[PDB]
């Protein structure tokens, strides 16, 4: 339901409505925040990177 990029440009809209139900997914598959296939592969910016700049 949630990936990099979808979750990516959902917090760059700096809308907190549709990332709601982002915590249950990702505690029913066990994952994480962090995970490499998770966050840009170029850098390693993770979504509090991105809504920082996106500020």
Do not use: Q, Y
Not at 13 to 32: E, I, M, N, Q, V
Request: hydrophobic residues 40%.
């Amino acid at each position: 339901v949630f990936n990099r990029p979808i979750l990516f440009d959902i917090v760059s809209r700096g809308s907190t409505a549709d990332l709601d139900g982002l915590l249950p997914f990702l505690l029913t598959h066990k994952k994480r925040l962090t995970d490499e296939e998770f966050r840009e592969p170029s850098t390693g910016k993770t979504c509090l990177p991105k809504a920082l700049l996106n500020l």
